[PDB]
Design a protein around this ligand. Structure first.
Ligand SMILES: C[C@@H](O)[C@@H](C(=O)O)[C@@H]1NC(C(=O)O)=C(S[C@@H]2CN[C@H](C(=O)N(C)C)C2)[C@@H]1C
Ligand SMILES: [Zn+2]
Ligand SMILES: [Zn+2]
Length: 233
Protein backbone atom coordinates (compact mmCIF):
# COMPACT_ATOMS: atom_id res chain seq x y z
CA UNK A 1 0.00 0.00 0.00
CA UNK A 2 2.76 2.54 1.02
CA UNK A 3 1.82 2.08 4.71
CA UNK A 4 4.32 0.89 7.33
CA UNK A 5 3.51 -0.47 10.80
CA UNK A 6 5.46 0.80 13.79
CA UNK A 7 4.20 -0.80 17.03
CA UNK A 8 0.44 -0.12 16.96
CA UNK A 9 0.71 2.83 14.61
CA UNK A 10 0.80 3.18 10.87
CA UNK A 11 2.88 5.77 8.97
CA UNK A 12 2.59 6.65 5.33
CA UNK A 13 4.94 8.97 3.50
CA UNK A 14 3.06 11.60 1.43
CA UNK A 15 5.92 13.83 0.29
CA UNK A 16 9.71 13.99 0.96
CA UNK A 17 9.06 15.85 4.24
CA UNK A 18 5.52 14.82 5.10
CA UNK A 19 4.09 11.67 6.64
CA UNK A 20 0.64 10.67 7.81
CA UNK A 21 0.42 9.10 11.28
CA UNK A 22 -2.43 6.74 12.08
CA UNK A 23 -3.49 5.45 15.47
CA UNK A 24 -6.40 3.20 16.43
CA UNK A 25 -8.71 3.46 19.39
CA UNK A 26 -8.53 0.51 21.76
CA UNK A 27 -11.33 1.24 24.28
CA UNK A 28 -13.37 -1.89 25.19
CA UNK A 29 -16.81 -1.11 23.52
CA UNK A 30 -15.53 0.49 20.25
CA UNK A 31 -14.02 -1.13 17.17
CA UNK A 32 -10.40 -0.23 16.17
CA UNK A 33 -11.16 3.22 14.82
CA UNK A 34 -8.40 4.88 12.80
CA UNK A 35 -7.41 8.51 13.24
CA UNK A 36 -4.92 10.30 11.06
CA UNK A 37 -2.60 13.29 11.64
CA UNK A 38 0.61 14.62 10.07
CA UNK A 39 4.29 14.87 10.65
CA UNK A 40 6.15 17.53 8.81
CA UNK A 41 9.90 17.82 8.65
CA UNK A 42 10.65 21.55 8.31
CA UNK A 43 14.44 21.42 7.63
CA UNK A 44 16.04 20.92 11.06
CA UNK A 45 12.87 20.48 13.13
CA UNK A 46 9.67 18.51 13.08
CA UNK A 47 6.10 19.81 13.29
CA UNK A 48 3.23 17.62 14.37
CA UNK A 49 -0.41 18.07 13.42
CA UNK A 50 -2.69 16.27 15.90
CA UNK A 51 -1.90 13.74 18.68
CA UNK A 52 -2.98 10.16 18.57
CA UNK A 53 -5.96 8.92 20.65
CA UNK A 54 -3.87 8.38 23.82
CA UNK A 55 -0.77 9.58 25.50
CA UNK A 56 0.93 6.24 24.99
CA UNK A 57 0.17 6.23 21.31
CA UNK A 58 1.37 9.83 21.07
CA UNK A 59 4.61 8.77 22.79
CA UNK A 60 5.00 6.08 20.11
CA UNK A 61 4.67 8.77 17.41
CA UNK A 62 7.54 10.65 19.16
CA UNK A 63 9.70 7.50 19.18
CA UNK A 64 9.06 6.95 15.48
CA UNK A 65 10.08 10.56 14.87
CA UNK A 66 13.19 10.12 17.06
CA UNK A 67 14.20 6.97 15.18
CA UNK A 68 13.26 7.79 11.60
CA UNK A 69 13.95 11.54 11.54
CA UNK A 70 15.88 12.35 14.71
CA UNK A 71 15.22 16.02 14.78
CA UNK A 72 13.60 17.96 17.66
CA UNK A 73 9.83 18.43 17.59
CA UNK A 74 9.51 22.17 17.63
CA UNK A 75 5.72 22.29 17.97
CA UNK A 76 2.44 20.54 17.69
CA UNK A 77 -0.85 21.99 16.49
CA UNK A 78 -4.13 20.21 17.28
CA UNK A 79 -7.19 20.72 15.10
CA UNK A 80 -10.04 20.49 17.62
CA UNK A 81 -10.92 19.43 21.14
CA UNK A 82 -11.87 15.77 20.61
CA UNK A 83 -9.89 12.72 21.80
CA UNK A 84 -8.61 11.58 18.42
CA UNK A 85 -6.85 14.99 17.98
CA UNK A 86 -5.99 16.05 21.50
CA UNK A 87 -5.95 12.78 23.49
CA UNK A 88 -2.13 12.88 23.72
CA UNK A 89 -1.41 16.36 25.00
CA UNK A 90 0.26 15.19 28.23
CA UNK A 91 2.73 13.11 26.18
CA UNK A 92 3.61 16.18 24.11
CA UNK A 93 4.02 18.26 27.24
CA UNK A 94 6.12 15.65 29.05
CA UNK A 95 8.44 15.86 26.00
CA UNK A 96 8.74 19.67 26.30
CA UNK A 97 6.97 20.29 22.94
CA UNK A 98 5.19 23.64 22.54
CA UNK A 99 1.55 23.03 21.73
CA UNK A 100 -0.94 25.27 19.83
CA UNK A 101 -4.70 25.06 19.38
CA UNK A 102 -7.61 27.30 18.44
CA UNK A 103 -8.38 29.48 21.47
CA UNK A 104 -11.87 28.03 21.35
CA UNK A 105 -10.39 24.45 21.46
CA UNK A 106 -8.49 25.47 24.61
CA UNK A 107 -11.73 26.96 26.14
CA UNK A 108 -13.66 23.80 25.27
CA UNK A 109 -10.90 21.46 26.44
CA UNK A 110 -12.03 21.09 30.16
CA UNK A 111 -15.60 20.35 29.06
CA UNK A 112 -14.39 17.77 26.51
CA UNK A 113 -11.94 16.18 28.90
CA UNK A 114 -8.83 17.38 27.05
CA UNK A 115 -5.68 18.97 28.35
CA UNK A 116 -5.51 22.45 26.85
CA UNK A 117 -2.66 23.43 24.53
CA UNK A 118 -0.09 25.80 25.94
CA UNK A 119 -0.78 28.51 23.38
CA UNK A 120 -3.96 29.80 21.77
CA UNK A 121 -4.37 30.54 18.05
CA UNK A 122 -6.73 33.30 16.97
CA UNK A 123 -8.06 34.07 13.54
CA UNK A 124 -8.88 36.94 11.31
CA UNK A 125 -12.31 37.51 9.89
CA UNK A 126 -11.25 35.86 6.60
CA UNK A 127 -10.31 32.69 8.51
CA UNK A 128 -6.52 32.91 8.34
CA UNK A 129 -4.61 32.46 11.54
CA UNK A 130 -3.32 35.70 13.12
CA UNK A 131 0.42 35.33 12.52
CA UNK A 132 1.37 36.76 15.87
CA UNK A 133 -0.35 33.74 17.53
CA UNK A 134 1.36 31.18 15.28
CA UNK A 135 5.03 32.14 15.45
CA UNK A 136 7.63 30.14 13.45
CA UNK A 137 5.05 27.83 11.91
CA UNK A 138 7.18 27.43 8.78
CA UNK A 139 5.23 25.73 6.01
CA UNK A 140 2.08 25.22 8.15
CA UNK A 141 -0.70 27.48 6.85
CA UNK A 142 -3.49 27.40 9.43
CA UNK A 143 -7.08 28.20 8.39
CA UNK A 144 -10.30 28.30 10.45
CA UNK A 145 -13.08 27.55 7.93
CA UNK A 146 -15.96 28.12 10.29
CA UNK A 147 -18.07 25.78 12.35
CA UNK A 148 -18.67 22.28 10.91
CA UNK A 149 -17.68 19.04 12.54
CA UNK A 150 -17.28 21.17 15.62
CA UNK A 151 -17.31 24.87 16.42
CA UNK A 152 -13.48 24.99 16.89
CA UNK A 153 -12.30 22.77 13.97
CA UNK A 154 -9.19 24.17 12.15
CA UNK A 155 -7.39 23.06 9.06
CA UNK A 156 -3.78 23.21 7.81
CA UNK A 157 -2.09 23.47 4.44
CA UNK A 158 1.52 22.52 3.96
CA UNK A 159 3.37 25.08 1.91
CA UNK A 160 5.73 23.65 -0.61
CA UNK A 161 3.50 20.61 -1.23
CA UNK A 162 0.13 19.86 -2.75
CA UNK A 163 -1.23 18.78 0.64
CA UNK A 164 -4.01 20.21 2.75
CA UNK A 165 -5.30 18.68 5.95
CA UNK A 166 -9.01 18.73 6.69
CA UNK A 167 -9.04 16.92 10.01
CA UNK A 168 -12.48 15.61 10.95
CA UNK A 169 -14.21 18.37 8.94
CA UNK A 170 -13.64 16.50 5.67
CA UNK A 171 -14.69 12.95 4.85
CA UNK A 172 -13.58 10.92 1.82
CA UNK A 173 -15.41 11.12 -1.53
CA UNK A 174 -17.12 7.72 -0.87
CA UNK A 175 -18.13 8.24 2.70
CA UNK A 176 -21.68 7.32 3.60
CA UNK A 177 -22.03 9.90 6.39
CA UNK A 178 -20.40 12.83 8.17
CA UNK A 179 -19.63 10.59 11.17
CA UNK A 180 -20.01 12.11 14.63
CA UNK A 181 -22.44 15.02 14.37
CA UNK A 182 -23.06 15.42 18.13
CA UNK A 183 -20.96 18.60 18.28
CA UNK A 184 -21.60 19.70 14.69
CA UNK A 185 -23.04 22.93 13.28
CA UNK A 186 -25.46 21.62 10.72
CA UNK A 187 -26.23 25.09 9.30
CA UNK A 188 -22.65 26.15 8.51
CA UNK A 189 -20.97 22.74 7.82
CA UNK A 190 -21.26 22.85 4.05
CA UNK A 191 -20.00 26.43 3.79
CA UNK A 192 -17.10 25.63 6.08
CA UNK A 193 -16.15 22.68 3.87
CA UNK A 194 -16.27 24.89 0.76
CA UNK A 195 -14.22 27.56 2.61
CA UNK A 196 -11.51 24.98 3.32
CA UNK A 197 -11.39 24.18 -0.44
CA UNK A 198 -11.17 27.84 -1.29
CA UNK A 199 -8.44 28.59 1.26
CA UNK A 200 -6.20 25.86 -0.35
CA UNK A 201 -7.33 26.04 -4.06
CA UNK A 202 -4.14 24.31 -5.40
CA UNK A 203 -4.05 21.42 -2.95
CA UNK A 204 -4.60 18.14 -4.84
CA UNK A 205 -3.99 15.73 -1.97
CA UNK A 206 -6.59 16.10 0.82
CA UNK A 207 -5.69 14.41 4.10
CA UNK A 208 -8.37 13.77 6.62
CA UNK A 209 -8.76 12.13 10.02
CA UNK A 210 -10.69 8.98 9.12
CA UNK A 211 -9.81 7.93 5.55
CA UNK A 212 -6.83 7.57 3.27
CA UNK A 213 -5.78 10.71 1.38
CA UNK A 214 -8.20 11.63 -1.40
CA UNK A 215 -8.64 14.08 -4.25
CA UNK A 216 -10.58 17.36 -4.03
CA UNK A 217 -13.69 15.27 -4.59
CA UNK A 218 -13.56 14.66 -0.81
CA UNK A 219 -14.28 18.38 -0.29
CA UNK A 220 -17.23 18.62 -2.66
CA UNK A 221 -18.68 15.28 -1.41
CA UNK A 222 -18.48 16.50 2.21
CA UNK A 223 -20.12 19.85 1.37
CA UNK A 224 -22.96 17.95 -0.37
CA UNK A 225 -23.60 15.63 2.49
CA UNK A 226 -23.60 18.64 4.79
CA UNK A 227 -26.11 20.58 2.63
CA UNK A 228 -28.41 17.50 2.50
CA UNK A 229 -28.25 17.43 6.27
CA UNK A 230 -29.05 21.15 6.52
CA UNK A 231 -32.16 20.71 4.27
CA UNK A 232 -33.63 17.71 6.05
CA UNK A 233 -36.66 19.19 7.91
C1 LIG B 1 -14.27 10.62 19.76
C2 LIG B 1 -13.97 11.68 18.72
O1 LIG B 1 -12.58 11.77 18.39
C3 LIG B 1 -14.78 11.50 17.44
C4 LIG B 1 -15.03 12.87 16.79
O2 LIG B 1 -14.06 13.41 16.12
O3 LIG B 1 -16.15 13.39 16.89
C5 LIG B 1 -14.12 10.57 16.42
N1 LIG B 1 -13.93 11.34 15.20
C6 LIG B 1 -15.06 11.10 14.34
C7 LIG B 1 -15.29 11.99 13.18
O4 LIG B 1 -16.40 12.19 12.67
O5 LIG B 1 -14.20 12.59 12.81
C8 LIG B 1 -15.73 9.99 14.75
S1 LIG B 1 -16.81 9.06 13.79
C9 LIG B 1 -15.45 8.38 12.75
C10 LIG B 1 -15.73 8.18 11.25
N2 LIG B 1 -15.68 6.73 10.98
C11 LIG B 1 -15.97 6.09 12.27
C12 LIG B 1 -17.49 6.05 12.54
O6 LIG B 1 -18.20 6.59 11.71
N3 LIG B 1 -18.02 5.44 13.63
C13 LIG B 1 -19.32 4.76 13.58
C14 LIG B 1 -17.41 5.44 14.95
C15 LIG B 1 -15.12 6.98 13.18
C16 LIG B 1 -14.95 9.43 15.84
C17 LIG B 1 -15.86 8.73 16.85
ZN1 LIG C 1 -14.04 15.44 16.37
ZN1 LIG D 1 -12.48 12.44 14.22
Amino acid sequence: TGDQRFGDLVFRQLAPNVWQHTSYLDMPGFGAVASNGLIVRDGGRVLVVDTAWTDDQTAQILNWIKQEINLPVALAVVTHAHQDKMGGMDALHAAGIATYANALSNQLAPQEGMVAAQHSLTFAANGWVEPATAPNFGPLKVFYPGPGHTSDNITVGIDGTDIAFGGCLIKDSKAKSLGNLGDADTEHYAASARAFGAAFPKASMIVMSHSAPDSRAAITHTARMADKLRKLX
